[PDB]
Structure formats: structure tokens, C-alpha cells
Ligand binder design. Structure first.
Ligand SMILES: O=C(N[C@@H]1CCN(c2ccc(Cl)cn2)C1)c1nc(C2CC2)ccc1Nc1cncnc1
Ligand SMILES: [Mg+2]
Ligand SMILES: [Zn+2]
Length: 313
């Protein structure tokens, strides 16, 4: 109860910032996550013995892949931490609880392959879940760990609140299917621009949480250039491996997943910042102004990718 977590001064300061990198010391990441839950939610939110055990079962069920790994799970929870800390009054006690756990669980048991590849490969998960194939798997894994013994971190909630929080987490994890981002933002854009957006509307709240999850999921594009640059290597490591597996199915992959088409990556990143990233943080800033630093950082990396094409690096 009186056992606070405390980080070194540089991390204690820098972890409040949006562009925070959790660093290469894996054994610190669980403590970083418990510090964030304590500040963002409260020392009373979770039983420390259960949370710690929950955290370590989740870690175990992430795989050793270049990008969609344990570090990504924690990085995505940090972004969600920063948003909730800068938007202090807007979110309920169950949301702040649900959302940090949703972020940590969002990519449980990821194999480094897109939904497309599972469909074309005719993976068993594709027959079980026809859309948002991995995301439904991710949520299924989350429920599996919650139900392990001594892992029910929500055991103080009423039966009804417990159902609410698992509904928050399900929708939250499904929203990280990028296929669903495009329509979600467009609907939020119109609701803002016609001025009919309404945070008391539960249908509206879900969409906003959906956008927050995309924002957090893509947050490697909102770091200082060196972190974003080096994370781009890990993502394409996964992309190029999948392309190889596409070729093995007798399918020429899209250039994004073809390693013989590295030259085209800089231009591919512009399209992505223009088509996906900037629109995502713009709309998010419009609905939550104190998230503006995610937009600024995103623009800074977009500018850096233009410099790459101009041969200045
Ligand atoms: O870039 C991403 N998608 C782009 C789509 C088009 N792109 C493309 C097109 C043509 C060529 Cl020839 C090369 N590439 C790539 C990306 N996607 C995801 C989720 C799987 C959806 C997450 C992060 C991402 N970027 C990222 C950048 N930096 C640090 N971390 C992640
Ligand atoms: Mg995912
Ligand atoms: Zn993810």
C-alpha cells in the first residue's frame, strides 16, 4: 500500500513526455509499467502481487520478433499513459484501468505476420476470425491470461464493472486493426467539423478510444528521429520476412513487403505519414488538444523522410 515505485531522475522526468523511449534494459520495463499504472490510475487500482504476475505472463506470451514484441507492448502503454496524464479529467476510473492493460495486451502472441498473410496462408485463426483476425486472437489471449490463477487483476470490480472493463479492452484491442482506423477517423472528423461530437455519447467515446489506440499503436512515428529511424528497421524486418513467405506461396508481395525494393522505402514512409500518421494525430489533437506534441513529433519525422529523398542523409 505504501510501496511506491520510483525511477531514476532522468526517467522520472522524461517518462511524462510523449517522445519517451523505454530504453534497452528489458528488466526495467515491468517496473516502468507499474509506475505508470500507479500515477495514471492509483496505488489502489490493482493488487501489486497480481499485477506483477499478470505483467510477467503477458511478457512470456509475446514472441521474439523484430517489432511486434514485448518492447512494443510497453512502448504502446507508455503513449496511452502520456495521453491519460495530459487529459486528467476526461476519462473514467474504469477507462484508465482498462486502457493501460489493453495497450500492454494489444499484440499478445503476434507472429510478425499481417491479417492478409494469415488469410492467404489459410491459417486456422482465419477460419475462426474472418476479419480483424490477429486482434480477436490478441483479445482471446488477454482473456486466457486474466483467467489463469492469481492473474485476475480486476477481482475487486463488481460483475457489471468487470464486464464493462473487458468490453473497453475488447473494443480497444479490435481498434488496433488499422483496416478499421480509416473509417473511424473519417466519422470522428465529420463529428468534429459539423460540431456534433459528444463525449457523453458511449458510441462516440468508443470511436475516440479507437483513435487513441491507433495513435498509441503508431507512436514510433512520434519519437525523436534517431528512435523512429531505428524502429523503422525492425518494422521492415517483419515486412520483408512476410514478403518472403508470400513468394513461398507463389505470390509477388507489394513493394512495402519486397526486400528487393528497399530503395522505395523513403517514398513509402511519406505516403504512410501523409495517408495514415498525420491524419491520425491531427484528428486526435482536434478532440484532445494536449496531445498536440504527437502531431508536432510526427511532422518532424515526415520532414526528416523528405530530407532522406533529397540525399541530405
Ligand atoms: O510504415 C508503416 N506502414 C507503411 C504502409 C506503406 N509502407 C510502405 C509502402 C511502400 C514501400 Cl516500398 C514501403 N513501405 C509502410 C507502418 N505500419 C504499421 C502497422 C502495420 C500497419 C506500424 C508502423 C509503421 N511504420 C513505422 C515507422 N517507423 C517506426 N515504426 C513504425
Ligand atoms: Mg497489432
Ligand atoms: Zn501494435
Amino acid at each position: 500500500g505504501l510501496m511506491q515505485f520510483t525511477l531514476p531522475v532522468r526517467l522520472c522526468k522524461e517518462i511524462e513526455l510523449f517522445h519517451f523511449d523505454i530504453g534497452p534494459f528489458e528488466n526495467m520495463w515491468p517496473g516502468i509499467f507499474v509506475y505508470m499504472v500507479h500515477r495514471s490510475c492509483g496505488t489502489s487500482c490493482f493488487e501489486l502481487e497480481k499485477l506483477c504476475r499478470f505483467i510477467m505472463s503477458v511478457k512470456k506470451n509475446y514472441r521474439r520478433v523484430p517489432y511486434h514484441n514485448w518492447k512494443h507492448a510497453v512502448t504502446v502503454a507508455h503513449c496511452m499513459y502520456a495521453i491519460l496524464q495530459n487529459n486528467h479529467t476526461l476519462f473514467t476510473d474504469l477507462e484508465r484501468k482498462g486502457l493501460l492493460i489493453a495497450c500492454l495486451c494489444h499484440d499478445l502472441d503476434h507472429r510478425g505476420f499481417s491479417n492478409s498473410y494469415l488469410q492467404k496462408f489459410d491459417h486456422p485463426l482465419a477460419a475462426l476470425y474472418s476479419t480483424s483476425t490477429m486482434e480477436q486472437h490478441h483479445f482471446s489471449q488477454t482473456v486466457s491470461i486474466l483467467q489463469l490463477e492469481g492473474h485476475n487483476i480486476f477481482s475487486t470490480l463488481s460483475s457489471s464493472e468487470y464486464e464493462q472493463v473487458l468490453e473497453i479492452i475488447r473494443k480497444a484491442i479490435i481498434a488496433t486493426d488499422l483496416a478499421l482506423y480509416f473509417g473511424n477517423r473519417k466519422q470522428l472528423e465529420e463529428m468534429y467539423q459539423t460540431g456534433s461530437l459528444n463525449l457523453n455519447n458511449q458510441s462516440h467515446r468508443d470511436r475516440v478510444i479507437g483513435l487513441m489506440m491507433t495513435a498509441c499503436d503508431l507512436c514510433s512515428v512520434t519519437k525523436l528521429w534517431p528512435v523512429t529511424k531505428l524502429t523503422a528497421n525492425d518494422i521492415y524486418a517483419e515486412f520483408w520476412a512476410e514478403g518472403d513467405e508470400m513468394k513461398k506461396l507463389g505470390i509477388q508481395p507489394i513493394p512495402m513487403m519486397d526486400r528487393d525494393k528497399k530503395d522505395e522505402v523513403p517514398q513509402g514512409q511519406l505516403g504512410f505519414y501523409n495517408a495514415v500518421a498525420i491524419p491520425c494525430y491531427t484528428t486526435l489533437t482536434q478532440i484532445l488538444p494536449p496531445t498536440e506534441p504527437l502531431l508536432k513529433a510526427c511532422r518532424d519525422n515526415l520532414s526528416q523522410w523528405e530530407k532522406v529523398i533529397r540525399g541530405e542523409e
